[PDB]
Amino acid sequence: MTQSVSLSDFIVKTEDGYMPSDRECVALDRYLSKEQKELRETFKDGKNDRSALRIKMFLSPSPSRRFTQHGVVPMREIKTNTDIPSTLWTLVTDWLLNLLQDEENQEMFEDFISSKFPDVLASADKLARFAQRLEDRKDVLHKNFSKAMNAFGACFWAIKPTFATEGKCNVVRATDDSMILEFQPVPEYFRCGRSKATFYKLYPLSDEQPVNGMLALKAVAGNQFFMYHGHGHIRTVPYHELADAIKSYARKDKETLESISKSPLAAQCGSKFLDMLDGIRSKQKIEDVILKAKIFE
Amino acid sequence: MTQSVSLSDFIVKTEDGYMPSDRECVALDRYLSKEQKELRETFKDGKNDRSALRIKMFLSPSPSRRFTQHGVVPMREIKTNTDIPSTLWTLVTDWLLNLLQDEENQEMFEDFISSKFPDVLASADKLARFAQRLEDRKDVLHKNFSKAMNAFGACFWAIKPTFATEGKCNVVRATDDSMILEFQPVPEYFRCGRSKATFYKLYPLSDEQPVNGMLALKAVAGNQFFMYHGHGHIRTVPYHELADAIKSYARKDKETLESISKSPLAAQCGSKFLDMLDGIRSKQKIEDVILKAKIFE
Amino acid sequence: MTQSVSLSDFIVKTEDGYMPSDRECVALDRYLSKEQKELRETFKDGKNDRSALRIKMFLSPSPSRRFTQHGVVPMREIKTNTDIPSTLWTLVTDWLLNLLQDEENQEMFEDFISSKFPDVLASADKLARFAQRLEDRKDVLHKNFSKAMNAFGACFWAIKPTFATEGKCNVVRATDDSMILEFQPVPEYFRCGRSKATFYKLYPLSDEQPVNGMLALKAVAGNQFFMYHGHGHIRTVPYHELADAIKSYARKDKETLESISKSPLAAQCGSKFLDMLDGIRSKQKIEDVILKAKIFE
Amino acid sequence: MTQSVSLSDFIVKTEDGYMPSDRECVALDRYLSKEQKELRETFKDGKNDRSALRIKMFLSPSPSRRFTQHGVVPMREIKTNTDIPSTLWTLVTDWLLNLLQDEENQEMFEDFISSKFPDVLASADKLARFAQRLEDRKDVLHKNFSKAMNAFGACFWAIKPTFATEGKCNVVRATDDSMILEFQPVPEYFRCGRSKATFYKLYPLSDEQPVNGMLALKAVAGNQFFMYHGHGHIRTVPYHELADAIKSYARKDKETLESISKSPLAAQCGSKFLDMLDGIRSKQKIEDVILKAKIFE
Amino acid sequence: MTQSVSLSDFIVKTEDGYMPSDRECVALDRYLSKEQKELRETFKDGKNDRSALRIKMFLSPSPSRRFTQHGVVPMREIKTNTDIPSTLWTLVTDWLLNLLQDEENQEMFEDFISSKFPDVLASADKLARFAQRLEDRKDVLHKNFSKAMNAFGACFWAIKPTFATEGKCNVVRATDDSMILEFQPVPEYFRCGRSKATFYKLYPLSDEQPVNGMLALKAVAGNQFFMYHGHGHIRTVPYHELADAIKSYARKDKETLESISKSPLAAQCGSKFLDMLDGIRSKQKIEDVILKAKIFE
Amino acid sequence: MTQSVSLSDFIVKTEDGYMPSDRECVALDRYLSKEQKELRETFKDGKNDRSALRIKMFLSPSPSRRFTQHGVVPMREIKTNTDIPSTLWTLVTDWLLNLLQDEENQEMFEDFISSKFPDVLASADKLARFAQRLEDRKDVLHKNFSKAMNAFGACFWAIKPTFATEGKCNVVRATDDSMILEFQPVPEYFRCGRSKATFYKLYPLSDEQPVNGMLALKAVAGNQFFMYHGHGHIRTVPYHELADAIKSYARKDKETLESISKSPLAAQCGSKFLDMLDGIRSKQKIEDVILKAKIFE
């Protein structure tokens, strides 16, 4: 489905200072350290909290044997096999290494990575949109380092994203409570994977259910669909791509689905979404129910 | 044979600070200092440890009479007559003069030059390969000054080179002990002299004789030849260029050859190399024995 | 699987002269011509030789109502939904429209398109490799129009490709009969889809089964696999990507498989390939047999 | 109001070949020709068909006394006093002079100028939009000279504009009969005067009144206004700029207004437009009735 | 005084086609042709119509012995010793050689050079101003070759210059008869010699003495001086530079001065100019009379 | 010694039109034609007029089997192993292929190659100097194709070089009979091999022995040496490089030396040159006699 770009593909730990990572060669991976090999053996042994083991793996240093001319080879367990544009890699690595020239900043990064990160993997389109806001000089992220770090963290499913921590956007219309934003296709030389068309969103303001937000979105969306991916948003997708969304609904956990179903904001979205949720809860075949819910009245 | 580029062709001593060296004119060399002329007379008198006298010459200052507009004229005894590309000279001189803006660094340089340097002359291809790794911005040498210093020193036959202190390379395959690396032809605008094709190498890891390294190299080398130039490596050369290698075997000293023959790593290389060593020890004609050892079975 | 780029995505028919095609909008597709709508209705009615109907559709002109500012909108039946780099589209469209400034050349193109084209769709990597050979000025395709044209033809499964009609390659070794060539990864700004590593090939010379070609390729391939995709070649793929190849073996027709199995060149490839062919003929599950044949002895 | 750019500000007649026009100096205008001075005196005498006299003036040659180094000074009666960007002037003059290198083309231009041109003056924004479509290389106007000529002529109120003869646009939605198009603000380095925001339009297909076009435009327009400026279009403007439109409604002739009111397409626009037309026909004060019709229900 | 640039410093005759001239070397001038040496001997013998002999010399071909790599060496009698900017030489030589690719044009050039040219030498500032009008693309000289050739000829004292045949200018004011023009300092990278400030002029229209032209010039000139250099103009110079003008009045011939004094246009200039002419006719000392006429009333 | 660049390293024969030559691969050389293999066998058999056989080999076409993507592989008998700068190869190949677009020019080239060419090989420095005169736009070679072809032919020891057919030079001084020219070091990005300093020459004018030329050269040469390399010139070389010249005197044939010794121009050079010629005729050791003749009086 949606390919994910790991953190180690951008930067790996070293003795004292973090170093850029080269995926050109994988032959050097044979050698390792005692703790590294012990954790590798435990990870390969059985399925026991793989994500926690991965996080523990990423926080251990590396020996000098893995050094090459360009940089440092990562491990074989925290590395993906998806290609990314050169500009994105260069910009992200340059900024991240520029920020990491401080022991206190190092401790802050470790505290954040140990605080709320559920898994290393992150969506590619999130990274592309975040780098869209970092390439241009006249923005807000340059002056406020903390807000930029919040944005980058929430880019990888860490904290609930507000308006100021989103990607690249331009508010098209507001109201008394909540707002509606419009997104645009990412330019070609940032794209990594499939392309997506225009699609709006909605962010409740503080706590209360919107009243005119539904009317405004219905006026704006026109021919579209509603959903409650994650928590705290009401995304809209075109009818076609919703097909792939059903696949993304297969991997969802039972506890997560139960938590989603127990939210008034989930009920506020509309009518057909609850029917689709009941259909996916029925554990029947996906295609037929998907087309039944996808009929155009 | 292989032309050598002296150190003085890049930089010469001065009163306090080192200055770039101009080989445009040689008329100013008539004047000299008392110690300089005394050492010149002693060097011209008889053959008594020429290399030590050269090292002593390079470590004495120069008067203000030798200054010109561009720079300082070197001596007539530590200067070569081989042309080098402008880019190589500019880059090496710029970096070396950038590093020498410190009295403590000056003392360190003098201590190193008095420690292990056997002679001023150094191979041209080694210098070209070293400058290949210095031109690009994203490397390791920029951050670690000490490692780059050892790399430059070992470029002129001072330190046994490890993997991190080699030139430009990319590891193609490893194993439990020792590695195999691949080299590539140097680009045109760095070349100074003849051209050489692809040729691999091998570096024992810590102390033990490799077991699978011979098999791996035999798989990789295919149609090639083995040798034990220097100590600590097993180089491979094409059949044709080995001709010139025989000339390089003529100038080798008896003590050096005896020391080479008394190494188990020399015996480990193969079978034909020992036959060639015995042939060169026989003090017979070079061409006939060379072609006898160069037959393709 | 391997996405295909149709011909209409590059160029569509018009009244007299061919025009570039814009995929920006699909709103104008509602209008059509009498023959166009009749063919669309027949195509939608039943499954009766879809490829022939598609070819007939591509050879009918278009009305002036479909014209826009940028160009002409194509039909909804001969258009794909895969994105391609701008440079590839620009270069291919420019060259093709440059060639099409002649009535006799128009007739030749129509005759060729009606002669041996089995379907409009063509592989993306074939187009990328063909454009790799067209971007540089110093090649052979510019001088010889017909030889260049047969390259584009065989690029879309029209004629058996010889050496002079291949993509971008450099002969690495030859012998008395047949040759072996090496390919390289396509640069980033041409890539459309997944990436592939180095892989060789082999082309029988005139008619006879090679004798030393198997030994030479075995020496070159090392750790690789053999196959007989199509006719007239012995391709080699890495072990991993062969997984996807099994999927490509699912869509193969029974008659095509029977024709492939009745060739001595198919028997000449080796031993495991016949076992894999028998396994896919057994109509059992794909994954288990695939892993059984993929074991490393 | 809306400033107009005359034709003579771009090009003036000469002895044989048309020449570029320089507005730097007006001192040379004192001298003239016999026919030129007679027509100037008649024009200054009384108000008798000023437009026809202007057209007659523009079609007479000029003497050699008016030549300067840069070009030819125009007359004082067919020249405006509004500044225009350099790029627009350069592009239009270059293309027009490139077209005028033919006696037959000269005769065609004269016949067209004598056929349907009501007055020399033309709107600035129309010219800017037309030049927007001429700057880019990949368009349709370059290949078809006749269509570009029709586009340029209709740019100055000569021909009823179809879709292919409009400015820069991109069809956003169609239907069985008629289409709806969207416009965008012109970039800064083409702007000459005030700025205007997004505004749509609509056009008939052949003769019949649209049925779903009103619904589609109402869905698209949202908060906007309807109008019937000219004939054959239903333009939409924002509420604010409609103020200026009332001024443009003051200069309209009684016969033109009567002809406009006698069209079913004028009745098809809506309800408030007829009320506004009745108000302007009442010959009362403009501001109060304008605000009464501008109330937001 | 005012340095003059000869024609031969730009172009010299050859066997068939004119060639660019190189003044780098003068050693090759020793060899010559029979007619060339005879004319050189006659010229060196006595003072008998030097200008006619020079013109005859310039119209004879040159042998192949004088050819060099860059071009052809000129003679020692028609070559100056003043340096000129590279751009001026390149532009003039390029245009003149572009024009000279025709036998009929060659005959026309010879006829013109034999018709009205009094001497080869020409003023440097005239050449600079003429090249000022040739560097820019949007002028009149490019289209009309004949007018450009007239302008170039009049640049070297061949025909009376009209307005269209002048240098670089911009009419600032006109009247019923005659005009007044303003000049500006030539930019730096064209300058060859001293610099001059702003100075106006006046050109009678057809034949009659101007009436309001004197008043207009007096209004414009303000603090300046009047003169009648040459025929057909009333130039104005600043008070300081008039000093050098007196030197230019020393070399004037008696017949030329008598012809100048017998013109009503000379009387029309003013009052002080006649006094200055009488003073220079008195054949007294130049400085004292110059300051007497230069007093500021 | 002085490396030679063959003609085939720039261009090889093909079926109809000559093609650029690629030395990247030599694997394709196994295949050949019947005449080609017969001539190769005869050449390898015995030493019988190798140069004539080489010339015959170069004038036979090549089959289509040798074609590659870049160009055509040459034969293994007319190809060198010396590297040359890219710019030189590109310029020479481009000009030569531009010249060869004519059947009559093809016949002329074949007639010239069969007329006076003694061997394919040619000196590198001659080629570099010739290309020095072809890179700049303002020369004589561009207009006169015949003179350029003569110059290129004489570059490879075919025609006795005159002044107009030499390389890059600038006459520094002349006299009644014969001239003296000065050369300069070739810039870096043209150099292929060792470097040489300033050195003059002398060319007798028509037939007679110079009288003041010896005095002029003695004034100019100062500290230098005289020689009679080839016929029709008196070259001068520095004392050091004359060492290498002695090696060039070893390969000279007895008949050529006898012909050289029988020329009055050989006697005119001086005194020491005859002594050196007698010494090399004595067939004694080269070094001792060379140093005896190299003593500085």
Automatic annotation (TrEMBL), chains A, B, C, D, E, F:
- Catalytic site positions: 233
Main location per the UniProt record: host cell
An example GO BP is: viral genome replication
Could you name the domain of life of the organism this protein comes from?
A: Viruses
Give, as one word, the top-level EC class.
hydrolase
**Molecular functions per Gene Ontology:** ATP binding; hydrolase activity, acting on acid anhydrides; metal ion binding; RNA binding
Would you name any one GO CC term?
Answer: host cell cytoplasm
EC number of this enzyme: 3.6.4.-
* Binding annotation for ATP: 119-121, 201, 229-231, 235
Compartment(s) where it occurs, according to its Swiss-Prot or TrEMBL record: Host cytoplasm
Sorted alphabetically, which keywords does the UniProt record give?
A: ATP-binding, Host cytoplasm, Hydrolase, Magnesium, Metal-binding, Nucleotide-binding, RNA-binding
This protein's cofactor list reads: Mg(2+)
Database matches in InterPro entries:
Rotavirus_NSP2
Q: Which family is it part of?
A: Belongs to the rotavirus NSP2 family.
Q: Quote the function comment for this protein.
A: Participates in replication and packaging of the viral genome. Plays a crucial role, together with NSP5, in the formation of virus factories (viroplasms) which are large inclusions in the host cytoplasm where replication intermediates are assembled and viral RNA replication takes place. Displays ssRNA binding, NTPase, RNA triphosphatase (RTPase) and ATP-independent helix-unwinding activities. The unwinding activity may prepare and organize plus-strand RNAs for packaging and replication by removing interfering secondary structures.
Task: Give the record's subunit note.
Answer: Homooctamer. Interacts with VP1; this interaction is weak. Interacts with NSP5; this interaction leads to up-regulation of NSP5 phosphorylation and formation of viral factories. Interacts with host DCP1A, DCP1B, DDX6, EDC4 and EIF2S1/eIF2-alpha; these interactions are probably part of the sequestration of some host SGs and PBs proteins in viral factories.
Instruction: Report what the protein is called.
Output: Non-structural protein 2
